[PDB]
């Protein structure tokens, strides 16, 4: 289902969870002609009160989004969240099919380190 590169950071000064969506690679092809039109939907479980979407990157299986989204999350609540990064195939007329997703449970993220990480997308 491809791979996603992202970076997770927390601005303690402003109580901001910072989600960098760098790129995806080796995505499956969902359009005729052997390509896709990927974008990423980004939101937090379990409350789901704010969703972001990257730009749509047309006709590519290796989109470089280079976008960053911020969520106001009080520090004491951050460990109860799960970050969802869901990669969709855009289509002009039909429903947008999900390609894959990667979820990050915050109750294991320490922010003891901030890195750019690759993950295999999952169903």
């Amino acid at each position, epitope marked *: 289902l491809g791979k996603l590169q992202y970076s997770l950071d927390y*601005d303690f000064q402003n109580n901001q969870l910072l989600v960098g969506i760098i790129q995806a690679a080796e995505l499956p092809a969902l359009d005729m002609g052997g390509t896709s039109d990927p974008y990423v939907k980004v939101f937090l479980l379990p409350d789901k009160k704010k969703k972001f979407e990257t730009k749509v990157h047309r006709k590519t299986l290796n989109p470089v989004f280079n976008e960053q989204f911020t969520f106001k999350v009080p520090y004491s609540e951050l460990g109860g969240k799960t970050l969802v990064m869901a990669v969709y195939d855009f289509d002009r007329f039909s429903k947008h099919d999900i390609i894959g997703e990667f979820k990050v449970p915050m109750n294991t993220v320490d922010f003891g380190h901030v890195t750019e990480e690759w993950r295999d997308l999952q169903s």
Partner: nanobody
Amino acid sequence: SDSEVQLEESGGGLVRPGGSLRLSCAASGFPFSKYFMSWVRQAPGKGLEWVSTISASGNYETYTESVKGRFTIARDNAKNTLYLQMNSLKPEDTAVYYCAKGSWARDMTRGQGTQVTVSS
């Protein structure tokens, strides 16, 4: 809320077509090294438009189609500074250039701007 953010551009000026210019931007009031940063511009007669974004790490750079290959974005997280090297400048590149906090959003926090005019 970016009430504390301060962004200060410099480096603008008059350029002949084909010439070069380097902008810089001093950033204060927020953990600069954690944020993606962007250059955006507003040309005479057009809306604000995205020019380039650099990741917080400085490792990933993206560029609007009309400046690809000609502009380079860079950052120094130790000195909280953002740079835009502009080579092979075109008259269409005339605009107020702004350094901006985050990846592209029409309402993103921006500096005061620096004027770049490309003229014969």
